[model samples]
Target: QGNIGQVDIDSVILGRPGAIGSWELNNFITIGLNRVNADTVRVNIRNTGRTNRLIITQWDNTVTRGDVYELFGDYALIQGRGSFCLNIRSDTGRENWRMQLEN
Candidate 1:
């Protein structure tokens, strides 16, 4: 696959839908992740949207030393370790939010 540049706010993330709250840019928030064999990672979310919002928060929660997974949210449940991406689409058919993921 081609090297997708740093995922920015305009990026169209795809996945199931979830409820959104009114979280705007500069909002203080946290994204949490846990892997059995790897380091536990947490992302700090700083919203850069017209309004505050909530996105589907999906995670594998399970990982072995030899396994890797990507975490995104949409479906209420995820069962394995693999590549996942958070799909944050506004209910108004627009994506006006940005977040930063940290470890």
Candidate 2:
């Protein structure tokens, strides 16, 4: 069995290398990039939420608005004690972008 849910990507103060959106899963889980409101968005994954702890940063790709981009085997797995952060600039800011996660 697994859990499924969606999260609203709320707006945030925008600047290069600033956090414009984020989601922190509290447990080991897999997240599926179901949809977004921008043509593309910057992202970073980390083991912890502190600064300079990024596992991957400024990773850009084709995540078209309203399209699905599965990270790994149809989902991006967040290992135990891990979390992810989605970053953006004022130019790329959007509302109502959403994601699905499972555990």
Candidate 3:
């Protein structure tokens, strides 16, 4: 638990529909993964922070590491170890989601 890295994703993330929504930038919080070892992801969100926490509506990836699977109301259950293009669109309005990792 000592050797870990962190990235603070504090943004007023954009939102739209859930898995049935549009895949446009104006309609989603687009996260493209080209190369990295991102096992799991956290959308642990808010602002409405508390009232309207981010509900992960949908997502898409060019590839995955098999063990990856996801779905969320406030966090995407998507977790795997691979890299590719990924896109995630949410519910609505704006909110901030934050996070961690280990070695």
Candidate 4:
């Protein structure tokens, strides 16, 4: 766990999408974008394993996997009044994914 924008955030590390189940990225005053360290990260539907495909919910939008997506961005708020989240799952169930919450 780490602290950024005066809020406590957590990270997710998974070897496969089956390891997660409807995970929440927690609310914050302002958060950063979620990303993976590997070449590709798969987002699967909640309550289902890698068999079910789903789009990852980031902040106020959804993202589709195609190429390498890195977490090189941050979110800011005025008067500390904003928050964001991330929902992702694995598609190949073999690649390693790591998400770090920090500034």
Highest TM-score against the true fold, candidate: 2
Per-prediction CA RMSD (Å): 16.6, 10.9, 16.5, 14.6
Regions of candidate 2 where Cα sits further than 4 Å from its true position: 1-4, 12-17, 29-40, 47-75, 78-94
Cα lDDT of model 1 by residue, 1-103, tens digit: 0011112332222212322222222334323222211222222243333323323322222356542223332221122222323323323243322333231
TM-score of 3: 0.21
Poorest stretch of ten by lDDT in candidate 1: 1-10
Clashes of 2: 0
Would you list the rank order by lDDT, best first? 2, 4, 1, 3
lDDT by residue for model 3 (2-56), tens: 0022222323233222211211112223332111113222222111111211233
Evaluated at residue 100, the lDDT of candidate 3 is 25
Tell me the lDDT of model 1 at 99: 35
**Candidate 4 residue lDDT tens string, 46-100:** 2211121112212212267543433423322223323344334433332223332
Residue-level lDDT tens digits of model 2 in 30-55: 22221132332344343322222222
Better model by TM-score: candidate 1 vs candidate 4: 4
- 2 or 4, which is superior by TM-score? 2
Candidate 4 error regions (>4 Å): 1-69, 90-103
Winner by lDDT: 2
- Which is better, 1 or 3, measured by lDDT? 1
Better of 2 and 3 by lDDT: 2
Question: Once superposed on the true structure, which residue ranges of model 1 sit more than 4 Å away at CA?
Answer: 1-7, 14-81, 85-92
Q: What is residue 44's positional error in candidate 2, in angstroms?
A: 1.9
